[PDB]
């Protein structure tokens, strides 16, 4: 089981764009420079992998995604993972897939909150999971 959280209005706990970008870059060892590139959903899938062993199957997700239907399929995988872990935060795939700043940043800040909620302290190599 996994616990869930929300994000309504909190001060001193909202992180900057560059800070969260560095967080994802360091936690998955890559070089994103634009936060809206997280519309790919690969980062979220690997994040779910690192949060819970198994719980996903990275063979279906396409890290080389460059089209919209690919984004939709990756988000279908993410939704399946969310259902499996019992986290009930419905995700707005329709706005996310267009790759715009607003909903991408909203989803990633909520996801940072949820990640801080359900992380233990394990270490591993993101590359072996990625390949």
């Amino acid at each position: 089981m996994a616990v869930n959280v929300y994000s309504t209005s909190v001060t001193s706990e909202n992180l900057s764009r560059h800070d969260m970008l560095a967080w994802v870059n360091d936690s998955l060892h890559l070089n994103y420079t634009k936060i809206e590139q997280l519309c790919s959903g690969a980062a979220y899938c690997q994040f779910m992998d690192m949060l819970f062993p198994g719980c996903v199957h990275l063979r279906k997700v396409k890290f080389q995604a460059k089209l919209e239907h690919e984004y939709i399929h990756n988000f279908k995988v993410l939704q399946a993972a969310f259902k499996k872990m019992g986290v009930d935060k419905i995700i707005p795939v329709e706005k996310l897939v267009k790759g715009k700043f607003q909903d991408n940043f909203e989803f990633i800040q909520w996801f940072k909150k949820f990640f801080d909620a359900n992380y233990d302290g394990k270490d591993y190599n993101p590359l072996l999971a990625r390949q």
């Binding site: 199957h57 063979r59 279906k60 939709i72 399929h73 988000f75 279908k76 939704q79 399946a80 969310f82 259902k83 419905i90 995700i91 795939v93 329709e94 897939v97």
Partner: protein, 435 residues
């Protein structure tokens, strides 16, 4: 010139036939006396034409107890039917598959086959048979199994659709429904080109929730099933922006030959008092369709997978809104598709809006939608029956009625292993493959 005949077996079959043919007579402007005081000959599908303006249906009403057939004969739709296709037995099978398949069904099967052949021989482009029967009664189950055998042996490859009354999980009217259900399913699994499950409890819930009829009767359920069937046959019987045939139904909905059990859903279902207050957009009705409450089987799809879906729209339907609605449905969370099917939607469009029956319960709308989905959660239902069967088979209950009527215990056994094999097939389809 595009013909498709109907076969109504059992009391449920006859009552749904009353509803469906009332709906048809209303749709094509046919008086009960068969006269005619978005349209092509649209009626040429169901209605054969005589020398005068009289039109008669191409349907067969067969039932071993003459009660319902007498009610049809003495009812308002008396002059309409040709007196031959109102076939009666003498004694009912009495919830006994053995009596309805070996002892009594044999005594009138030849006449039914002869009448069916007479109907077919004067057609030109017969597509297939619409079989309306229940799994509960012995008549329905056994006689439908026998008739499917005979039709498959006689007619090689014609689509044979079954719209069965699947036994409900908890709301039952009989006691021996499990035996009859397993026997008829095991028998028809090799002949049913596509079988559409519908359940009584779910339709009760829909009527209570949406129609706001605190005390509905079988008339309303028959009306809903008739609306479903009319939506299915609208493409054949009417002009459409995107037409669809029966073979299309049989092809797009059946990935594996043994798994051919879709379930039906209709929308919108709202009363005249509630007919206003909402515009009934295509996105709205599609959302209502994919909602698990509006489905007509007590099986929740959210714990399974959608192998295929076929949505038929009728009325003033604009296709771009269809595309947008389908995309939004695909984006949602409660619809996760199986790995091997990346594209599980078929769409059909017809210009003819649904027809409202005077004295009915629904309201005249401008758009309508039928959802025919082959999903995985339905397998769960089968398990329930199996459990019941094993319980009733633990102490050899009610077995003597079948044994002393021309049945072997090995038949019950082989039905049980075949049913377990079907469950295993459903499970293995459910799982995902490597790489």
């Amino acid at each position: 010139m595009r013909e498709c005949i109907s076969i109504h077996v059992g009391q449920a079959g006859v009552q749904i036939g009353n509803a469906c043919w009332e709906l048809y007579c209303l749709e094509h402007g046919i008086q009960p006396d068969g006269q005619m005081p978005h349209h092509h000959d649209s009626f040429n599908t169901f209605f054969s034409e005589t020398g005068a303006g009289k039109h008669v249906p191409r349907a067969v009403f067969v039932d071993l107890e003459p009660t319902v057939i007498d009610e049809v004969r003495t009812g308002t739709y008396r002059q309409l039917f040709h007196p031959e296709q109102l076939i009666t037995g003498k004694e009912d099978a009495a919830n006994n598959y053995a009596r309805g398949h070996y002892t009594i069904g044999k005594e009138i099967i030849d006449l039914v086959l002869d009448r069916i052949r007479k109907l077919a021989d004067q057609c030109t482009g017969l597509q297939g048979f619409l079989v309306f029967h229940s799994f509960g009664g012995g008549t329905g189950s056994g006689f439908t199994s026998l008739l499917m055998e005979r039709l498959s042996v006689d007619y090689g490859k014609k689509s044979k659709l079954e719209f069965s009354i699947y036994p409900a999980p908890q709301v039952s009217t009989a006691v021996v429904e499990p035996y009859n259900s397993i026997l008829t399913t095991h028998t028809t699994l090799e002949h049913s080109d596509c079988a559409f499950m519908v359940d009584n409890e779910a339709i009760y819930d829909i009527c209570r929730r949406n129609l706001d009829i605190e005390r509905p009767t079988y008339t309303n359920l028959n009306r809903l099933i008739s609306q479903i069937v009319s939506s299915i046959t609208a493409s054949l019987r009417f002009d459409g922006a995107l037409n669809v045939d029966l073979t299309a139904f049989q092809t797009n909905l059946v990935p594996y030959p043994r798994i051919h059990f879709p379930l039906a859903t209709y929308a919108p279902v709202i009363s005249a008092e509630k007919a206003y207050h909402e515009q009934l957009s295509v996105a709205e009705i599609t959302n209502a369709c994919f909602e698990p409450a509006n489905q007509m089987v007590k099986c929740d799809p959210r714990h399974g997978k959608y192998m295929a879906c076929c949505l038929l729209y009728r009325g003033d339907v604009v296709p771009k809104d269809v595309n947008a609605a389908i995309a939004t449905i695909k984006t949602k969370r409660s619809i996760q598709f199986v790995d091997w099917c990346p594209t599980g939607f078929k769409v059909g469009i017809n210009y003819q809006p649904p027809t409202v029956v005077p004295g009915g319960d629904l309201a005249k709308v401008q758009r309508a939608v039928c959802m025919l989905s082959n999903t995985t959660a339905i397998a769960e239902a089968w398990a329930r029956l199996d459990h019941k069967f094993d319980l009733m088979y633990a102490k050899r209950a009610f077995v003597h009625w079948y044994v002393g009527e021309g049945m072997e215990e090995g038949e019950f056994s082989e039905a049980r292993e075949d049913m377990a094999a079907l469950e295993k097939d459903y499970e293995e389809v459910g799982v995902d493959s490597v790489e």
